[PDB]
């Protein structure tokens, strides 16, 4: 097992990146005040291999300026956890 | 999913009080904990939230300087500080944890009387 | 805040009627930010419908959501002595998140 290197950045779209993890298997998601948004207001990276047999995905939403602090990405990989903010 | 309330409380008028919910079922740092408050015969408020993984907690304006949220792992527990107590305090106070909504789970509530 | 405003504030049902209560905020919100809670007299608040239309886990089916901008509803198709309660919106699309005042619904005999 290879843990998701994981990246927020913020273009207002904030996107979620997990890298160079193993296996495939993983959950990703926004949240809202902790609430997680539907499938259908996200948008969705496949769960691609990296030449270095591992995988890389991402999730995306998009928010209005000044939300940035109610939005998390939750991650879940091989029974560990976390959670990480947009950066500022 | 369980969450145990502390149980009821009586406090002095300008007193502080804080009052515990312990969380089971799920990974405590997993999903984030929030706390309503219900006066009697009346409707629910909303205090604030705390994201547990990196401790970040958001208030409510009616309630900033009088809440405070803490959490602690050892005993996979929420807390709510309550200073500078008034009867207008007095309430049932309740525990929640959010997933497809703001409070998907609720715990069995706390009653605080404030009283002299 | 976002005000929600529930009618009826009560209402009582016959048994096996179909009775919608309605949940008006002040200003538009995304249906997936709107959610209903039923709180039983002696306990707590519990989740009812999210995100407007989905039904919370042992929710039966007989209850159902809808709605969308400032306009939501909650319908029992069939009331049932066990749905005597009362019902809360909620709305978590802005800061503070706020609750409607609640519609308490009673069941005629």
């Known amino acids: 097992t290879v843990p998701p290197m994981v990246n927020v950045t913020r273009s207002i779209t904030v996107t979620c990146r997990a890298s160079s993890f193993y296996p495939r298997n993983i959950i990703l998601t926004w949240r809202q005040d902790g609430v997680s948004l539907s499938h259908d207001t996200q948008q969705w990276g496949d769960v691609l291999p990296d030449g270095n047999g591992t995988y890389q995905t991402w999730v995306a939403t998009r928010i209005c300026r000044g939300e940035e602090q109610r939005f998390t990405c939750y991650m879940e990989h091989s029974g560990n956890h976390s959670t990480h903010p947009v950066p500022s | 999913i369980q969450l145990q309330q502390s149980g009821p409380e009586l406090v002095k008028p300008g007193a502080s009080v804080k009052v515990s919910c312990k969380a089971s079922?799920?990974?405590?740092?997993?999903?984030?904990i929030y706390w309503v408050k219900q006066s009697h015969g009346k409707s629910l408020e909303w205090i604030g939230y705390?994201?547990?993984?990196?401790?970040?907690?958001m208030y409510n304006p009616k309630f900033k300087g009088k809440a405070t949220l803490t959490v602690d792992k050892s005993s996979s527990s929420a807390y709510i500080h309550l200073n500078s107590l008034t009867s207008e305090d007095s309430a049932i106070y309740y525990c929640?944890?959010?997933?497809?909504?703001?409070?998907?789970?609720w715990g069995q509530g706390t009653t605080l009387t404030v009283s002299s | 805040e976002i005000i929600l405003t529930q009618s009826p504030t009560t209402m009582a049902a016959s048994p096996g009627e179909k009775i919608t209560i309605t949940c008006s905020a002040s200003?538009?919100?995304?249906?997936?930010?709107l959610h209903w809670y039923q709180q039983k007299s002696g306990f707590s608040p519990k989740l009812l419908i999210y995100?407007?239309?989905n039904l919370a886990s042992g929710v039966p089916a007989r209850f159902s959501g809808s709605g969308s901008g400032t306009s939501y509803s909650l319908t029992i198709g069939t009331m049932e002595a066990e749905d005597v309660a009362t019902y809360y919106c909620?709305?978590?699309?802005?800061?503070?998140?706020?609750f409607g005042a609640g519609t308490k619904l009673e069941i005629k005999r």
């Open positions: 929640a944890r959010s997933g497809s909504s703001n409070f998907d789970y």
């Open positions: 079922g799920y990974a405590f740092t997993s999903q984030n």
């Open positions: 705390i994201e547990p993984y990196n401790v970040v907690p």
């Open positions: 200003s538009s919100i995304s249906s997936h930010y």
């Open positions: 995100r407007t239309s």
């Open positions: 909620q709305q978590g699309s802005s800061l503070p998140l706020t």
